[PDB]
């Protein structure tokens, strides 16, 4: 039951490069979800957490990434905005739970981290199941750009500053998301069921 192995990962990827660790063909004890005292948020959308153990899933998933602290409340169905469109779009029929916890004392640097980057602006919402690793140059105007800033040539790459003088909303946080799917296939993962 190697969920703690995912929990204690030393390094985390960028927000645009969220990694999916496939969970299948393993009996899920789900003991890690009990110790919620160390978890900042514990909520589920489209699924009843009480009936998680009593029902069996054909396949299950777990996704881990790092974002800022104040973005926890924006991870909800029916929400719009730049973060909800160009970073991660939640379908109205999403079935899963969103879990995050404090990591400022472990994932913050005095000089500021320069490892998590993404794309600030894009023309439209990301198509489903797309890995947004594109670094296209933003060009609002009709004047062509030669890769160097100038007349109507704005560099779309910006860096964040993690400093002690910053507020609470600049703190780094660990985020882990679990999604359970029930396709037109028989169940393969079952709880211990006492």
């Amino acid at each position, epitope marked *: 039951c190697p969920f703690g192995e995912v929990f204690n990962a030393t390094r985390f990827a960028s927000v645009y490069a969220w990694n999916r660790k496939r969970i299948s063909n393993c009996v899920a004890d789900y003991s890690v979800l009990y110790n919620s005292a160390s978890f900042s*948020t514990f909520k589920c959308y489209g699924v009843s957490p009480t009936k998680l153990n009593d029902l069996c899933f054909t396949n299950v998933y777990a996704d881990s990434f790092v974002i800022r602290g104040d973005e*926890v409340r924006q991870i909800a169905p029916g929400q719009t905005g730049k973060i909800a469109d160009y970073n991660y779009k939640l379908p109205d029929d999403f079935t899963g739970c969103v879990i995050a916890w404090n990591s400022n004392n472990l994932d913050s640097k005095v000089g500021g981290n320069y490892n998590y980057r993404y794309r600030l602006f894009r023309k439209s919402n990301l198509k489903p199941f797309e890995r947004d690793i594109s670094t296209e140059i933003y060009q609002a105007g009709s004047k062509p750009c030669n890769g160097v800033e100038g007349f109507n040539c704005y560099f779309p790459l910006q860096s964040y500053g993690f400093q002690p003088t910053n507020g609470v909303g600049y703190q780094p946080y660990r985020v882990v998301v679990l999604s359970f799917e029930l396709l037109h296939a028989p169940a393969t993962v079952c709880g211990p069921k006492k």
Partner: antibody
Amino acid sequence: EVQLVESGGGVVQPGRSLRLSCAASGFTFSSYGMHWVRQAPGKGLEWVAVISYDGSNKYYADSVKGRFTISRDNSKNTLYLQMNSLRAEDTAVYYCANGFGEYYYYAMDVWGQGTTVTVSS
Amino acid sequence: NFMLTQPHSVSESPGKTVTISCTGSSGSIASNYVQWYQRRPGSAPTTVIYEDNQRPSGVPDRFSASIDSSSNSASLTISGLKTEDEADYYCQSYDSSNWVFGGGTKLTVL
């Protein structure tokens, strides 16, 4: 359906401790968690301590920790809440409550009749 | 530090809209669940609503609650007040490693 009986001492003079028990009867104690919470007169419910299913997680308030202890025993199918270093501000009514559902401790489900503990003269 | 401020009481004319609110600040209240409890005078507390969307067995169908995202607060409404429904209600929430119970808004049917 759910019936709880509590037995033990009541009024206690300062200088000695008190044996407090919330015996479990009519429900499978070893499958559900247990908690002890305080309800001071007039004021609302105030958290004092919480114990996990295995008891490895014991959390207490910062300003009162070190003296107040929480406990449980699955082997004996009974509940014990040992109170140490009782003061004049610790006089209130006590209750034993089990968590809502299995392995969930963010809510309270059933409250017994409770016991009265007083430290005064 | 997690103190709360609520109105002492609320009353409206019959036929109007009535709700019970426990509005928190210094942090989103919809981030975690809020539990509704009923405390009858001289009776042990009994859960009537849990997780803001489900009712235990035997709970009357007139009990309901939800979350209004416009103001980000928990509202509990009961339609058709009756004498048998008179009790004391409080909100519930847990913050990190401690549990905080709100003052609550009193609903009385006299």
